[PDB]
Amino acid sequence: TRHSEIIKLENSIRELHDMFMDMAMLVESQGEMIDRIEYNVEHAVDYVERAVSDTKKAVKYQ
Amino acid sequence: LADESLESTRRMLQLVEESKDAGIRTLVMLDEQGEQLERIEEGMDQINKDMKEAEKNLTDLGKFAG
Amino acid sequence: LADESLESTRRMLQLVEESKDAGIRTLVMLDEQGEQLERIEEGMDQINKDMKEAEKNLTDLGK
Amino acid sequence: GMDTSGKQAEAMALLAEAERKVKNSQSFFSGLFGGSSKIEEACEIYARAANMFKMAKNWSAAGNAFCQAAQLHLQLQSKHDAATCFVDAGNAFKKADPQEAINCLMRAIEIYTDMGRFTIAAKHHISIAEIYETELVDVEKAIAHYEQSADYYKGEESNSSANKCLLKVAGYAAQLEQYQKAIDIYEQVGTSAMDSPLLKYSAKDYFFKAALCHFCIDMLNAKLAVQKYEELFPAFSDSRECKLMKKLLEAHEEQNVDSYTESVKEYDSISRLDQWLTTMLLRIKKT
Amino acid sequence: GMDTSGKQAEAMALLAEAERKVKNSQSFFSGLFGGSSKIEEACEIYARAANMFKMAKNWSAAGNAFCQAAQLHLQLQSKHDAATCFVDAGNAFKKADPQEAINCLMRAIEIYTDMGRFTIAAKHHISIAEIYETELVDVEKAIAHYEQSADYYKGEESNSSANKCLLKVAGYAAQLEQYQKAIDIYEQVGTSAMDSPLLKYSAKDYFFKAALCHFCIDMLNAKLAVQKYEELFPAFSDSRECKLMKKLLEAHEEQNVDSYTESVKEYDSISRLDQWLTTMLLRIKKTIQ
Amino acid sequence: GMDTSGKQAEAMALLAEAERKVKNSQSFFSGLFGGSSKIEEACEIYARAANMFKMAKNWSAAGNAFCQAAQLHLQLQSKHDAATCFVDAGNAFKKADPQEAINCLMRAIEIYTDMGRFTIAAKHHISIAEIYETELVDVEKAIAHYEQSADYYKGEESNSSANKCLLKVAGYAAQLEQYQKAIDIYEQVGTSAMDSPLLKYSAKDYFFKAALCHFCIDMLNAKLAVQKYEELFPAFSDSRECKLMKKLLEAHEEQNVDSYTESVKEYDSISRLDQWLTTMLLRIKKT
Amino acid sequence: MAGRSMQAARCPTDELSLSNCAVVSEKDYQSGQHVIVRTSPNHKYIFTLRTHPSVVPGSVAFSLPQRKWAGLSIGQEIEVALYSFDKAKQCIGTMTIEIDFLQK
């Protein structure tokens, strides 16, 4: 019965290994995307801030 | 030998099954955040374009008025 | 058979240690992403509040 | 404690000020025609009053104030802020009394779908289904809500979201002695799960489930379905599930009740079963 | 469906109103002036009608309305609204009839690359490739689309997506295209992955695929390829793939179908074989002579 | 491809008409002084001509156009647009000739620091450091850039990025045989990681590397250092790394190469080693 | 005799299970008629009919042996058409039968 145990151990260990590699790949991709979206969001924040500042000054000129 | 072997097989089986199930569950959940994240990128870029074009057109119109 | 068991044991050792080693760094990466999420949330909230107040003030002034 | 009492006291004060505001605002509009700024100010007063009501731990009155603000705002020919107020009132009404929460969330879904946005409507639909399931027993409405949200999600190409809703609907349908819908949903999702590089490993499980419910008919149909699935997924026999199904079929053919019980117990020991599986297996054993 | 019946009734009502609005447009372009706002309102009602048609399950009608609104909008010196409407029409046409979806998506791609947003253009290209390969029985255009997507991704520094795209296109081409491109792409991706700690533990599979591609052509060159790989990657020697390949080539040298068959069956005993690998093994077997 | 090259020549003609625009600035703008939007659209045509160059795979021309557009656009106004153009030019110059990419990136760094955006500045600092590592051979400049980026990151409590930057810096310094800084950084990062339940499995390697660095300088104090580490972390002895270090240091008391060689080979038999570790061991164990 | 769509059902009585007839409604057929049951282009089976009052119109009932021979599932759709023998060519002279105990 122990030989069946060792066979199933090998199979499950091999499966868990492959799973983990897939998760590592997906996590890396998600991190890359998070970096790019954070950059874009900060740029948009700065752009809108200066936009509102300039628009308020233009209104004040009136 | 018998008692220790039975202990080992039982614990190995239960631990392996737990790890397998948890791994499959994490596998299945990751895709939901992936797709949502595609969606949020879409919305973010649309917002960026819209606001940029709006402000540039409005500055041009204000210059025309003034 | 017993030597087959021993070599299979070596295989189990190697596989388990490799999986644990990769687990450590995967957890570190997850922590980094969790860290970045809060900052992006805060920046998004700030921009939303600023744009809302600015546009509402401009609309009220237009009247 | 003391902070809550003070918040509620000033909240009643602001509610009196707000009723005065609305009354005098209609009076001043009639007598002077001052515009609509006073109405917006009254709406803001209502919003802040509802916020401090929530701070005071009185969700019913906070939701009432939010609904009043929403209706006054939609009377002002503006929707998005009214929709936000309606959803806030629904969230407030989630606890305590959730009945009117259902109606207000229906109104929010109606306005959202009128605008043309789908994902938020699907989220509200699933939330309403969850409310019905957790607090009520009318599972028919929950089935309808889950199916509608799933349909929206698939139409918007959100297959991942649709899969969970379909699985929930199939499970609930199988629970209420209905097997056609469960069989169809389970087999469809399993087939669409064949090629997933990630989900393929779990693709077996759904198939097994279907077989179980398909056995609620009789020995034979079940054999044909399981062998068809085995051909369609050649590796399906690798797992112990096919062995267990074969054991169940052979034991039930000869009426070997004790062996069937012992095999089920052995499977439970190696891997425990949930309430649904135990109930289904016991129901199968009855005949 | 009663809800569907009323939905279709109001859809027809909106279509009639849109016909009246195109009458308004042609009258304000020839009879009146300043009709740009009027035709903008016409576009608004067209978009409402298309969205509610999509709600009505009438995908073809929704797509046709979307396309009509988009082409009408193009004339107003507006391009991004045109791109969004084209993307909506393509999404509507994804199901049912996707042929015109390809044309609309190509137009949207052209406009996008005219502006300069490449990443979204690459995603739309990959969507075109996937729909073509899943629904249209042809692979060469899929190869071209994957090459374009890889070029766009690698030109924007997005390395991982380009790597996956290149791996997929190379693997597919190896099936029905000369193996030289497959060898080159597999070697390139393996070299890129080795230094990185991400796929360094998975590069053995890519080296195995490259070695199989080498073997499918000739043996001596395959032996040179495997010895070069194990020289450059010392850890591959212990890889079970290395022993499997050595056994396979040793058997092939003597021309014994029996030993090769039993070895591949033993390898299949553990884990499981794949369709592409099985086909490659059968193809190399069939020329044993 | 070949067809887009002709339109790249047409984009060179677009640059020629932009030369005509600056000629307008020279002579005609006296009567068109209000045409600052003319300068803005000149910058826009510059930018899209540079985009066509990029699509034409003329990296030098694309970078030249980007730099010219940035220089013309940074008229003390719209500084963020100029910074975006400069970073685009730097990315274009990353391939082919990256030398001027460093200068354009430093200008963008200065602009952002004046603005106060520390995160993007630190990211660009890391970018310039890594391009130094992979293209040039200088390490000291990369070391200084990494130290500055780590300071900027730690300013805003971004501890993980600073910790990894310091880990790389400490590794390089250990390669550059400055062991005091290496041990300081390694101890700091390991002890900080031991604070959180998340990263409690990772210290073992950090402490092992710190012990190696310490044992490189003074072997007599290595025993005291490892004892202090063990009493600090009671589960540091159970690990195989501590056992291997103890075995090596006890064997070094007697001049027997065979013991340590067999120990290192046995350790390598379970897992492969890295270039840094192997080189450090080969250097230290020589005496 | 063009053939019609039916649903397969379970045999209603023990006695009828032992008859080897397919069991039908009096509304659909008459006892002693023969039919061809079609499950696919390549799968056709001939049965003799017997009526029983309990059979629901639009269904044909089969015993477990019949279901296991013809490959039928309870609930499945089948096509059924009347079949006429040529009795000049179909009156059994001799028939060889393999036999064994049913229950071990």
How is chain F classified by DSSP, letter by letter?
Answer: -HHHHHHHHHHHHHHHHHHHHHHHHHTGGGT-TTTHHHHHHHHHHHHHHHHHHHHTT-HHHHHHHHHHHHHHH-SSS-HHHHHHHHHHHHHHHHSS--HHHHHHHHHHHHHHHHHT-HHHHHHHHHHHHHHHHHTS---HHHHHHHHHHHHHHHHTT-HHHHHHHHHHHHHHHHHTT-HHHHHHHHHHHHHHHTTSSTTTTSHHHHHHHHHHHHHHH-SHHHHHHHHHHHHHSGGGSSSHHHHHHHHHHHHHTS--HHHHHHHHHHHHHHS---HHHHHHHHHHTT-
Question: How far apart (Å, rounded) are the C-alpha atoms in residues G46 and G38?
Answer: 9
Q: How far apart are CA E282 and CA E175, in angstroms?
A: 13
Taking the CA of residue F51 and the nearest CA in chain E, the distance in Å comes to 7
Report the distance separating Cα D162 and Cα A16, nearest Å.
27
Sequence-ordered list of residues with C-beta below 8 angstroms from that of F182, at least 6 positions apart, any chain: F170, F171, F173, F174, F210, F213
Chains G and B touch (3+ CB pairs under 8 A): no
- The reply to whether residue F48 touches residue E116, judged by beta carbons under 8 angstroms, is yes
Residue (of G8, G10, G102, G98) closest to G54 by Cα position: G10
Instruction: List D residues 3-62 in contact with B (Cβ-Cβ < 8 A).
Output: none
Contact with chain A for residue B61, Cβ under 8 A: no
- Integer CA distances (angstroms), E4 to D141, D220, E7, E57, in order: 19, 41, 5, 9
F174 exposed, middle or buried (CB, 10 Å; 0-12, 13-18, 19+)? buried
How big is the CA angle at E70 (ends E95 and D159), to the nearest 5 degrees?
30
Q: Per the CB < 8 Å rule, is E80 touching B49? A: yes
Burial group, residue C35, by CB count within 10 angstroms (0-12, 13-18, 19+): middle
Subunit contact A26:B30, Cβ cutoff 8 A: yes
Q: Which amino acid is at E103?
A: N
Position D52, amino acid: M
CB of A56 within 8 Å of a chain F CB? The answer is no
- What is the rounded CA–CA span in Å between residue G90 and residue E214? 65
Compute the distance between CA of residue D168 and CA of residue D143 in angstroms, rounded to an integer.
8
Whether D42 contacts D22, CB under 8 Å: yes
| Residue D269 in contact with partner chain B when CB distance is under 8 A | no
What the block records as the tokens of E49 is 């009608």
CB of D199 within 8 Å of a chain B CB? The answer is yes
Give the three-state DSSP class for A55.
Answer: helix
**What are the CA-CA distances from residue F132 to residues C28, F105, F108, F135, F173 (Å)?**
26, 13, 17, 5, 16
Cα gap G74→G68, rounded to integer Å:
11
- Residues 6 or more apart in contact with residue G5 via CB below 8 angstroms: G77, G78, G79, G80
Spatial neighbors of E39 by CB under 8 A, at least 6 apart, are: E21, E24, E25, E28, E29, E72, E76
Six token digits for residue F229: 């580490």
Do the beta carbons of residue D241 and residue D278 sit within 8 Å?
no
Quick check: D210 and D236 in contact, CB under 8 A?
Answer: no
Q: Which amino acid is at F44?
A: E
Spatial separation of the C-alpha atoms in residues B33 and B27, rounded to whole Å: 11
Pick the closest to residue F141 from F125, F163, F122 (CA basis). Answer: F125
Neighbours of chain C (3+ CB pairs under 8 A): A, E, F
Q: F275-284 and F159-175 are packed helices; what angle lies between their axes, rounded to 10 degrees? A: 40
CA distance C8 to chain E (A): 13
Tokens 């070069």 -> residue: E228
CB burial of F257-284 (b: ≥16 within 10 Å; e: otherwise) equals eeebeebbeebeeeeeeeeeeeebbeeb
Q: What is the CA radius of gyration of chain F?
A: 28
Rounded CA-CA distance E18/E27 in Å is 14
**Identity of the residue in C26, C37, C58 whose CB atom sits nearest the CB atom of A55:** C58
C31 and F271 within 8 Å at the Cβ level: the answer is no
From CA C48, how far away is CA D79, in angstroms rounded?
19
Structure tokens at A54: 């300039």
Six token digits for residue D275? 């309430």
Our CA-based measurement puts residue F165 at a distance from the nearest CA of chain C, in whole angstroms, of 13
Determine the residue type at E138: D
First to last CA, chain B: 95
Q: Is E265 exposed, middle or buried (0-12, 13-18, 19+ CB in 10 A)?
A: exposed
- G83-102 b/e (C-beta count within 10 Å ≥ 16 → b): eeeeeeeeeeeeeeeeeeee
Contacts 24+ apart (CB under 8 A), F129-138: F131/F94, F131/F98, F131/F101, F131/F102, F135/F98
Nearest CA to D112 among D123, D101, D102? D123
Q: Is residue G92 within 8 Å of residue G48, measured between CB atoms?
A: no
Dihedrals phi, psi of D83, to nearest 5 degrees: -65, -40
Instruction: Go through chain E and tell me how many residues it has.
Output: 289
| Technique that determined the structure | cryo-EM
Nearest of D121, D130, D65 to residue D92 by alpha carbon: D65
Question: Closest by alpha carbon to F92, among F128, F125, F66, F56?
Answer: F66
Nearest CA among F107, F169, F93, F99 for reference residue F132: F99
Please, which residues 25-54 of chain A have a Cβ atom closer than 8 Å to chain E? Answer: 25, 28-29, 32
| A-chain residue closest to D240, CA distance | A8
The answer to whether A37 contacts B20, with C-beta atoms less than 8 Å apart, is no
Instruction: Tell whether C6 lies on the interface with A, counting CB pairs under 8 A.
Output: no
| Number of cross-chain residue pairs from A and F with Cβ atoms under 8 Å apart | 12
- Judged by CB atoms closer than 8 Å, whether chains meet at A31 and C40 is answered as no
Tokens representing E236 are: 């591959």
The contacts found for F145-148 with CB under 8 angstroms, 24 or more apart, are F148/F122
Kind and range of the H or E run holding D112: helix D99-115
Measured in degrees and rounded to the nearest 5, phi and psi for residue D229 equal -65, -40
Contact D199 B27 (CB under 8 A): yes
Phi-psi region of A54 (alpha: psi -120 to 50; beta: other; left: phi over 0): alpha
As a whole number of angstroms, the distance between CA B31 and CA D196 comes to 11
Q: Which chain E residue's Cα is nearest to D115?
A: E48
DSSP string covering B2-54: HHHHHHHHHHHHHHHHHHHHHHHHHHHHHHHHHHHHHHHHHHHHHHHHHHHHH
Distance CA G21, CA G61 (A): 9
First to last CA, chain E: 66
Q: How many residues does chain F have?
A: 287
Q: How far is D190 from chain B (nearest CA, A)?
A: 14
Residue identified by tokens 């990751």 is B30
For E:202-261, CB contacts with F below 8 A are: 235
- Dist CA D181 CA G54 (whole Å): 28
Cβ-count burial of E102 within 10 angstroms (0-12 exposed, 13-18 middle, 19+ buried)? Answer: middle
Residues D144, D160: Cα–Cα separation, whole Å: 19
Torsion of Cα atoms, F189 then F194 then F199 then F200, to 10°: 130
Token representation of residue F270: 């379970």
* Residue located via tokens 């009567």: F31
Q: Give the rounded distance of the alpha carbon of D94 from its chain centre.
A: 14
C-alpha dist (Å) from residue D197 to A23, C60, F213:
12, 55, 44
Stated resolution in angstroms: 3.7
Interface test with D, best of B10, B31, B37, B46 (most D CBs within 10 A): B31
Tally B–D CB contacts below 8 A.
Answer: 22
